[PDB]
């Protein structure tokens, strides 16, 4: 059936896209439209799985979704495309000349895309390996945890803020000895006191989630930035 | 819908 | 000592390579050079051992070496890289940003690399389990045998071309008889023996190049006629 | 050197 639609073409391009969409196409498209895409070397997965080797993300703009943030740890990310690509493509299909250059997500340039080829992840580069995350983090620890691990964090230790003792805090073993992601000033005070009582001479970094989000969008941890840093002892 | 963080 | 050179780096990538080189680096680089490599999660082996779980091959181009052919049965092969990778990397070390994508060997695409994840070997998929191999095969039976076994052949029966009888020929326990031969004289001898003693049975006789091209595509194309000297099916 | 087959 799709084949009939595509019979009318002399030759089909192979876009070679393994994508997820975020902020778009939240189910699929009709079955014809989907079978066409695969014939054109475009495959769209529901969720991100490390062994499908995604290389593309469709999104209307830079977004703070789990999918968008994770797309920045593709190996590599090759294309970050507006949904208009698929739209224009199917419009034409229903010779094929839609191109991969007229549809860049504004703000995601080559310099950032190219960092996904680096042999390291952004937090791995920053020597942030094991962190502590407060249980009341917006988005919930499972998601935020999954994003952070996608970006080179190996251990995510969740802290019930109200309850936790110093012994619950894990060190960042790979440099900051203690790294914590927090929500409240009420938590900064508790944690600095605990650590400073028990491990006075050691270093501490306490940041907001937004600090991680900015690092991911830039694929760089900027340690000279005081934006989103709540406390540091170095 | 997908949660924005 | 390599630490000193590597001290000046804030953080070191872990390339997680277990490799052999063929057509390049034919023993090594200096002791510091290799020490650096290990610190970067790159380990280079002399020979291929099945339980080292190699995942990488460095080579300038697709080659017909034993090592190259055998890399196509790594479990899986993850990287087939030009030596320029080790070179540009060591050059940079003497932050580290050398990537594993800018050094692909021509002709070794993802579709091929990913066939090495299959739960079968190329000849096993093809139902070529036991074969007969003429003793005058270029490269020698030992090596060619080792390549074929790495690729799913369970039994290699070497046949003394000139002197062998039908009883020496083993069946492929689908082609009942599979032989890899060198010359036309050999085709005629073997087809005659088998047709006299087991007339109604099937036979496949190929050249070494039939196996090589099967390996390079990780697929036995039974519709191909190239390198097939005789078939009765 | 390595035998090319």
Curated annotation (Swiss-Prot), chain A:
Post-translational modification: Phosphorylated by MEC1.
Entry's localization field: Nucleus
Domain BRCT: 9-90, 107-215
Function description: Required for resumption of chromosome replication after DNA damage, specifically in S phase. Is recruited to chromatin in the presence of RTT109 and RTT101 in response to stalled replication forks and acts as a scaffold during DNA repair.
Note: Present with 1380 molecules/cell in log phase SD medium.
Assembly and interaction partners: Forms a complex with the cullin-RING ligase (CRL) RTT101(MMS1-MMS22). Interacts with MMS22 and RTT101. Interacts with histone H2A; requires H2A to be phosphorylated (gamma-H2A). Interacts with RAD55.
Name of the protein this chain belongs to: Regulator of Ty1 transposition protein 107
Organism: Saccharomyces cerevisiae (strain ATCC 204508 / S288c) (Baker's yeast)
Parent-protein start and end of this portion: 821 to 1068 of 1070
From Swiss-Prot, chains B, D:
Domain observations: The [ST]-Q motif constitutes a recognition sequence for kinases from the PI3/PI4-kinase family.
Record PTM text: Phosphorylated to form H2AS128ph (gamma-H2A) in response to DNA double-strand breaks (DSBs) generated by exogenous genotoxic agents and by stalled replication forks. Phosphorylation is dependent on the DNA damage checkpoint kinases MEC1/ATR and TEL1/ATM, spreads on either side of a detected DSB site and may mark the surrounding chromatin for recruitment of proteins required for DNA damage signaling and repair.
Origin: domain of life: Eukaryota
Location within or outside the cell: Nucleus; Chromosome
Coiled-coil blocks: none
Protein name: Histone H2A.1
Residues of the full protein shown: 128 to 132 of 132
Motif [ST]-Q motif per UniProt: ranges: 2-3
Subunit structure, interactors included: The nucleosome is a histone octamer containing two molecules each of H2A, H2B, H3 and H4 assembled in one H3-H4 heterotetramer and two H2A-H2B heterodimers. The octamer wraps approximately 147 bp of DNA.
Protein's job: Core component of nucleosome which plays a central role in DNA double strand break (DSB) repair. Nucleosomes wrap and compact DNA into chromatin, limiting DNA accessibility to the cellular machineries which require DNA as a template. Histones thereby play a central role in transcription regulation, DNA repair, DNA replication and chromosomal stability. DNA accessibility is regulated via a complex set of post-translational modifications of histones, also called histone code, and nucleosome remodeling.
Induction conditions: Transcribed during late G1 and S-phase, repressed in G2.
Organism per entry: Saccharomyces cerevisiae (strain ATCC 204508 / S288c)
Note: In contrast to vertebrates and insects, its C-terminus is not monoubiquitinated.
Residue positions where Phosphoserine is found in the record: 2
Family note: Belongs to the histone H2A family.
UniProtKB/Swiss-Prot annotation, chain C:
Subcellular location: Nucleus
Signal peptide boundaries: none
Stretches assigned to the BRCT domain: 9-90, 107-214
Post-translational modification (record): Phosphorylated by MEC1.
Misc note: Present with 1380 molecules/cell in log phase SD medium.
Role this protein plays: Required for resumption of chromosome replication after DNA damage, specifically in S phase. Is recruited to chromatin in the presence of RTT109 and RTT101 in response to stalled replication forks and acts as a scaffold during DNA repair.
Assembly description: Forms a complex with the cullin-RING ligase (CRL) RTT101(MMS1-MMS22). Interacts with MMS22 and RTT101. Interacts with histone H2A; requires H2A to be phosphorylated (gamma-H2A). Interacts with RAD55.
Protein name, per record: Regulator of Ty1 transposition protein 107
Organism whose genome encodes this protein: Saccharomyces cerevisiae (strain ATCC 204508 / S288c) (Baker's yeast)
